[PDB]
Amino acid sequence: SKYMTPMQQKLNEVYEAVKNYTDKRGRRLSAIFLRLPSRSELPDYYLTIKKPMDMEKIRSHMMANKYQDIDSMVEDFVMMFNNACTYNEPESLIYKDALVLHKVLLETRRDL
Ligand SMILES: Cc1n[nH]c2oc(=O)c3ccccc3c12
């Protein structure tokens, strides 16, 4: 087992910022984003969304050293939040959490 490369460390910092973000009430907005439900459980997502994405897929790719740069991981998160905001309506909580975590993601990015 190798120690994470310098790029994996920067990737991990972006990942953790999104994962660990809590609002003023202590709610961890990433909770619902960690693992997509199954096709059986959320069939309409799978009919609507061309490229499924969850944080577990991203974490696994990160830990495999498969991201070539920071922006490739950012793209996957952006895809995830866009999927969420396409499938769900602006009035839903998951939509608004996505917008908040999308902001958190870009802020973390700007600061690298
Ligand atoms: C539930 C649910 N409902 N709608 C969703 O959109 C998503 O993009 C997503 C991503 C990771 C985990 C769950 C979801 C999701």
State the distance from the centre of ligand 1 to the C-alpha of 66, rounded, in angstroms. Answer: 23
Closest to 19 (Cα-Cα) out of 112, 97, 110, 111: 97
CA atoms lying within 13 Å on the CB side of residue 3: 3
Q: Which domain holds residue 28?
A: 1-112
The number of residues in the chain equals 112
For the chain, first and last CA: distance in Å? Answer: 27
- What is the Cα 22 distance to its own chain's centre? 14
With b for 16 or more beta-carbon neighbours within 10 A and e for fewer, the 76-93 pattern comes to: bbebbbebbbebbeeeee
Please work out whether the CB of residue 82 comes within 6 Å of at least one atom of ligand 1: no
* Number of domains the chain contains: 1
**Ligand 1 and 18: CB distance under 6 A:** no
Which candidate, 33, 14, 21, places its Cα nearest to that of 84?
33
Q: How far apart are CA 95 and CA 100, in angstroms?
A: 9
H-run or E-run covering 90? none
Amino acid, res. 41: E
Q: Is the CB of 67 under 6 A from ligand 1?
A: no
For 31-47, the DSSP string reads GGGSSPPPTTTSHHHHH
100/81 Cα distance (integer angstroms): 10
Q: Give the CATH number, domain containing residue 11.
A: 1.20.920.10
State this model's resolution in angstroms. 2.0
**3-class DSSP state of 28:** strand
* 3, 46, 53 from 103: Cα distances, Å: 30, 25, 18
